[PDB]
Specification:
By secondary structure, this protein is α+β, with helices and mostly antiparallel strands. It has one domain: Ribosomal protein L5 (50s Ribosomal Protein L5, Chain: A). The chain contains 3 helices and 6 strands. It binds magnesium ion (4 copies) and sodium ion. The chain binds one RNA strand through strand 1, strand 3, strand 5 and strand 6. One of its GO terms (cellular component) is ribosome.
Length: 140
RNA sequence: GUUUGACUGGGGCGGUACGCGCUCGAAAAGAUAUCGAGCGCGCCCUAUGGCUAUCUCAGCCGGGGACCCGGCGAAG
């Protein structure tokens, strides 16, 4: 049963929602791979009327690139609880989000016969705290 | 020397139902009138055309009315 039910980290998105950049540079070094532009939608008063327009960057890290990052990111954060997803996710911080899920996720991300992951096989906030807390730190 | 139009609950004044498109009137095929009700067109676009690749939207919810992540979401 287990082994295929035990949590794992799938991508950690580090993004800097600026309002118009030079910031990529640090993201590249804090993570280890190129950043991606962040265009914005809708015209608004914060002199942000431009639809297509660089207004920040993000970086999606997977596997080791994500651990080797969290092995310093987490330590720089304290928070826990309430600040967790209903799907077992949590964002802290410059933002650093951690998407967590179990082994059969590809079923909902592939092209052919894709399917949505059953509520039971989903990751709960609690089942999430456990996994992570059980990895160099403490909850709440 | 001539012209100075037509429609019109008489004619004039007002209006254009004088060329066009849609809903209703219209009676569950088609056709269908009034100065019938609601309202539009006389353009604009080198992309706002064409194809291919990749992709899924509104709105709401939860975590850090811009941006980022997850979820619900046949279509508003
Ligand atoms: Mg004569
Ligand atoms: Mg005369
Ligand atoms: Mg007459
Ligand atoms: Mg008919
Ligand atoms: Na005439």
């Amino acid at each position: 049963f287990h082994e295929m039910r035990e949590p794992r980290i799938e991508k950690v998105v580090v993004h800097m929602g600026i309002g118009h950049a030079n910031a990529e540079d640090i993201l590249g070094e804090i993570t280890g791979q190129m950043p991606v532009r962040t265009k914005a939608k809708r015209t608004v008063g914060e002199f942000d009327i431009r639809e297509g327009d660089p207004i920040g960057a993000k970086v999606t890290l997977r596997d080791e690139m994500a651990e080797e990052f969290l092995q310093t990111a987490l330590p720089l954060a304290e928070l826990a609880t309430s600040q967790f997803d209903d799907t077992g996710n949590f964002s802290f911080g410059l933002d650093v989000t951690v998407n967590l899920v179990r082994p059969g996720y590809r079923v909902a991300k592939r092209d052919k016969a894709s399917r949505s992951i059953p509520t039971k096989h989903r990751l709960n906030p609690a089942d999430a705290v456990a996994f992570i807390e059980s990895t160099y730190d403490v909850e709440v």
